[PDB]
Design a protein around this ligand. Structure first.
Ligand SMILES: [Zn+2]
Ligand SMILES: [Zn+2]
Ligand SMILES: [Zn+2]
Ligand SMILES: [Zn+2]
Ligand SMILES: [Zn+2]
Ligand SMILES: [Zn+2]
Ligand SMILES: [Zn+2]
Ligand SMILES: [Zn+2]
Lengths: 461, 461, 461, 461
């Protein structure tokens, strides 16, 4: 069918203008001030912005981790993303040594198939870069459409890879046109500190932060950057949380190296003091890299404003406070690491970022949608509002005041780390490929509506 | 009338897509794959890109300088810009101490009125920030629509202002919402070096470079940046030519200061060796800051690619080689400083930048058009292709090979500093507010078609 | 006299050992563990260090400044220096435009003649680098023995010079073998901020600090550095007070530029909160650059420890609280700027530096004596304990705990800014050229004992 | 014996003066211009400097490495050191996983026993920081007198340790008062590049350099620095060869971190073009990190001049060209790595450093002797000329012009990498603890004269 969205203000990464948008089937087919569309359903967007749907490049739905499994699966997690104004996600497909990459990819398709309500791609974890793995990456990149590869530099004995793996992966990625993502903390420094903490009887949630100091994130960021330059490759640093890491990324980019950075709402608006909340409440805020001294936030906002960081992802990795986070009572090393971030990413960036003059409204689109599509090979199918693009559009009311709460969220988790936060901005309706997923804050989509996105090889934005 | 541009590929700072564009009168009114426009003139754009018209924020048409007057006036200079794919310019209105700002503004309107073939704004030179000047700036910014103020830190005893002027101007600009531009070289260091050179009998064109070392540009860049931070203001450094200056701008932006930078085609593709050309030919390349050791070029390209510099202007400031540049035979200090750059800016950036993978095609639009409109208060009227924007559009054929030459250029000057340069890309047709200025490489516009643009107060991009 | 100093521990910039020191006349002639000297007066130094006498390169004795004259003259100031373990000073000879350099220097000789109790050199202020001055500097360096030239970048309309003067002074100084010293704050920024504070009714002492932000010191430090590199000269930055400036000096020195830095005890141990003391008590702490946020102190200590700053001077510039500082009641711009620092320089560096592990004992001697002599052309005559040195020697008891007080100090001023500070270390006896000046904490010297030192041209240490 | 060294000029890290030196037994007992010593042997030092004997903190005598053993043992190597003006060495005791530290140390004592001609200390290699090793380090430091621990970050499968070992060593070293030394190149990057070169048929000596780019040294220098700050420890970076590494050390030191750097004569005066010499001659210059582009040399010289690097060691690790270096004909990875550098360290630093104005004469002594003693816990026994020091003294004639040649050197190796280099400066006589080792350029010492030095725990210089 045709849909004619009228009387709204389109805002993209470049443009801001009043016009109507005509959708035919899955795609935008016209934009204009006087289209006189026949036989289209009229959607009234008076008082709204039309935004390109957010694309969250950093999700962990139905992920085995921390001795348990994340509490949103592909159905609940994508539904919560859609309520939060996000229309595509790119989730991390994890691998184990000795298992083929393709088997892990099949496992991830089976997590999503028939369950996702909006569109999804996958990244692929590389645990080690043995010759068989390196050979396998060719069809992964070219045929499976997975063109970003994740290397974890922390989580020793669980996800951690070493310098040989990371350097080989960067060399191979350059050959194949893949982007290499890193989780950049020094896992060996962290392993020693956490063990020392526990030996001293320091077991409360706050020691999750103290045992991962920012210098450890800075060091691993710099190491990944050096190996990227030595490979002439392209690097994407996920969840940059601190000024130490920002400085290193800024220096690398001034040298003209192809180094990109992401940050996340939790590092913008939350700080290390949240982990001190008594009665185990601090465990709600345990995720890695840890929350930082509050002064780091403004350095992150500056880096987004001045183009040193290019994207915002959620690192959505939810565990209930009851039962799951409680695995870590008495031992912070056993608290499953991760927060429930997918749903509030867009609104927090608008309300704390745009409305406070930290970034522009056009930058907000670039960082939440367009630059993410471009770095992850989904542009221009996704990430904009333009003729020929999938009709993945959010009707957003910037005037609504509301309080973020577990009482009104849609993530399948028993708390919200932004509980009580006042924001402006409300996601009213959400289209995915021209079909409504959310309409007037009610879910009208369905399990399995979402489709897998085969992503293109890397091109610089 | 209506014009329906069909079968082309639209490229803007964000988007790239195949669709038709419908113009009605001065403005774009629809974009779409199947518009079925009635009663419109069909323009066939098969095999072309549709680009937003270039906006050159750095021109000096009919400028008194160097003991003479620049050789393009508002008619020839705007016609040459249009042939070169540039549809708007922002020219420097010069002032003298003791003269009202408003009198200089009237003088500049009289240079342009009835003569410009495409649209124009003005910046305003501040020579000194006495209380009367500071009072006058209020109606300049709010009523005359001149929202960028230029301070020259070099050209002692001609254009040069001091730290008191620059700091006061930055404070006042922050109050009024103006952007402060600087020409950043240390004029006192330069004055001493040029005098020493001449005392030693060093009079050839090459000593124009030797007497303005990059450290002098670095120093003044850093000084303007510090005073901007101390004022909490916003700074635009014009013609950044060297790595010393790039490093300082990159450090300032990592601190989250509102510091922006421009570079120019001459600093990207030409180097200090051009000034050594014998038989006085070196005088063709005398402009300030001088051409640099060639290694600086890649640092400039890196800075554009990674968002540390945001715009490219020409610093079009032409003087004939015969007669005018010859004022400096025997004394390089009397060679009128400036090059003929307006016409080749867009094609050089495409051919040396996009085609060689130094910047993306979307970045090329951002740096030549969209980011310039945004920093100079002309967006979204100018700088994009979108519903409601002025129909200022270039039909650009990226496949054409040609040689840049004085034999085929349109600038009213007897040489081209890019003589013999091979490029790809040809500007085929150029619309300004929906009327053709150039059509199939022939001039079909007219003197006085162009209109003055009253620019908005500063907003961060 | 022969004097034989027995049973003490010699400490120099390199060496720490137990041995006896034989003085014959004005000079050390032997050092050894069993000298069996005859016809020598035995001085028992049991439990003492023998230190080379402090050399204070930064004094302002009998200076016309701030609408009055500093309250120590050459007699009372050199007596207070000696009681503080300092045996040589280098004082700033001021000039004014149009005045012959030689007449200024004659004035300063008359201030010191028959009055100085210990030895003294002069720096020479340069207010203006006109051709006549540049010619006269040949004799200043080669007849008068003045090989350091001071340029003030602040104090507009009083002491301030511009970049023309600074750059020409640096070029001339390189020719002559002179060191250029700078007071590096941006005078034009400060002039505007101070006038704005007053106009806003912000007249209290604290606004002395707020109108001279650290970025104004960093900017001018950077500008003097760039001009020094442009001249291939040598620079000495007096009173570095803040991390902004240290960072710039560290960067210059990594490039191999000949840039040296000084700091002062007030910037190591006092902070901006002192200026907030009510009832005009904050006027006691008014000197420039101003006291800084306390975090800056450890950056300065780091820079001394790691060789980025090489010296400690006092900037002794004393004004009584009663009468003199009160010139600025109701208007902080009229508080004469300067602290009474000469007497406590050595003890503060030992007690807050050495004893706290911030610098070593040998570094203590280097920064207070040896490296001062080397940078200001007084070595090896002054600045060490070695055969052939002048016998300028302090017997220092490091075990004595005491308070600093106006009650026990010898500066001719009615307060001490370190009032109530607990320290270790006591200056017991002081020799200047083999003669006692202080013996067992009583004055035994004489007005006029001190000699003018003609200093050598610059050599890197 | 009493020896009375007359009419020479003493030079230390602080002092330069004319005086006589009296030695009684092993120690300096007096210094003075008229000592009238009796029953002393008169040594005429007219026209000589008296220097404190060089202390070479970086030797590999009788080392099993590279499929063979270095060609100087403790006798021939210490004899060559003495002829080069070096009177103490600190050699690297190697360990292997599972081996007791005390057994390794016993092995090294047996290498030196009855063989060393001058005094020697040992560093200890740490291959693995398992709990047993960390416990054994208590006695290594507090019984064996070994207070510097070496961690190799390259030489995979041979000497390399990982970040777990490095970080735990740094924490343990801080507890114990030990200095941690690092060979900082990224071993995993190097392993991959070396294998890739071979697979591509790039087997010549030059590929030794191309497979260890400077960024791999910068990365590992940065990583050791970050781990040191994380442990609040003290680090000494051996053989800094390139600007990338210097920049990182300069940055660490400006933060106040206790990070020290060493460089070596080969990196000051040889460059990467040496490895291109044909007919396998480039194998002569194969050592790691590799020779660098020549521009790096002046950055190193700058860093010594301005105190960013504090020492010069040799990395003496000699292999004959015939037989030993030839192990790597057809495969540069099998050329045993190391140069014959011990003998020429002092003269090269004097002739290319002091005489050319790159460092001062007093800095020369500091970096070759005094600051080495201080960092490695041998001061004041060693490293200076002062009452109570060991009488380790070099008579040095600075006026002698000569060539360096295998024909006249004393290292037990068939080539000298400085063959044909013109220098000034000749080592005439050398005293170790008051006894001649070299006298008028002939060997007069004896195998076993040298003593093991138990070194003190770390104190900042
Ligand atoms: Zn992660
Ligand atoms: Zn994650
Ligand atoms: Zn200019
Ligand atoms: Zn210009
Ligand atoms: Zn001053
Ligand atoms: Zn002063
Ligand atoms: Zn090594
Ligand atoms: Zn070695």
């Amino acid at each position: 069918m045709k849909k004619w969205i009228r009387n709204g203000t389109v805002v993209t990464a470049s443009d801001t203008y009043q016009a109507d948008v005509l959708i035919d089937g899955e795609k935008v087919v016209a934009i204009g001030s006087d289209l006189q569309a026949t036989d289209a359903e009229v959607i009234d967007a008076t008082g709204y912005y039309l935004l390109p749907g957010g694309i969250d490049p950093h999700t962990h739905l139905d992920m085995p981790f921390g001795g348990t499994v994340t509490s949103d699966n592909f159905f609940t997690g994508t539904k919560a993303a859609a309520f939060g104004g996000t229309t595509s996600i790119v989730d991390f497909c994890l691998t184990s040594k000795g298992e083929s990459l393709h088997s892990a990819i099949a496992t991830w398709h089976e997590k999503a198939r028939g369950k996702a309500v909006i569109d999804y791609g996958f990244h692929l974890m590389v645990s080690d870069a043995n010759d068989h793995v390196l050979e396998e990456l060719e069809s992964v990149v070219n045929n499976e459409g997975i063109t970003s590869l994740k290397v974890f530099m922390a989580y020793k004995n669980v996800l951690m890879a070493d310098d040989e793996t990371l350097f080989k992966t960067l060399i191979r990625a350059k050959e194949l046109g893949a982007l290499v993502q890193v989780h950049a903390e020094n896992g060996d420094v962290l392993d020693y500190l956490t063990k020392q903490a526990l030996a001293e009887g320091n077991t409360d949630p706050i020691y999750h932060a103290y045992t991962r100091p920012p210098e450890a994130e800075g060091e691993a960021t710099g190491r990944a950057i050096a190996l990227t330059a030595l490979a002439d490759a392209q690097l994407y640093v996920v969840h940059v949380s601190c000024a130490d890491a920002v400085r290193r990324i800024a220096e690398a980019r001034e040298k003209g190296w192809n180094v990109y950075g992401e940050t996340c709402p939790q590092y913008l608006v939350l700080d290390i003091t949240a982990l001190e909340k008594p009665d185990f409440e601090g465990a709600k805020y345990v995720w890695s890299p840890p929350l930082r001294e509050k002064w780091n936030q403004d350095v992150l906002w500056s880096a987004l404003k001045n183009g040193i960081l290019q994207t915002v992802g959620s690192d959505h990795c939810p565990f209930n406070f009851s039962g799951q986070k409680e695995l870590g009572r008495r031992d912070f090393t056993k608290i499953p690491n991760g927060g429930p971030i997918i749903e509030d990413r867009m609104t927090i960036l608008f309300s704390e970022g745009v409305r406070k003059g930290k970034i522009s409204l056009n930058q907000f689109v670039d960082i939440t949608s367009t630059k993410v599509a471009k770095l992850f090979g989904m542009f221009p199918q996704k990430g904009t509002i333009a003729v020929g693009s999938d009709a993945d559009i959010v009707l957003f009311d910037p005037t609504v005041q509301r309080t973020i709460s577990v009482e009104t969220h849609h993530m399948n988790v028993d708390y919200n780390p932004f509980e009580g936060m006042q924001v402006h901005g409300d996601v009213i309706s959400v289209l995915s490929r021209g079909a409504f997923v959310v309409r007037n804050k009610q879910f009208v989509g369905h399990a399995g509506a979402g489709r897998y996105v085969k992503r293109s090889t890397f091109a610089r934005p």
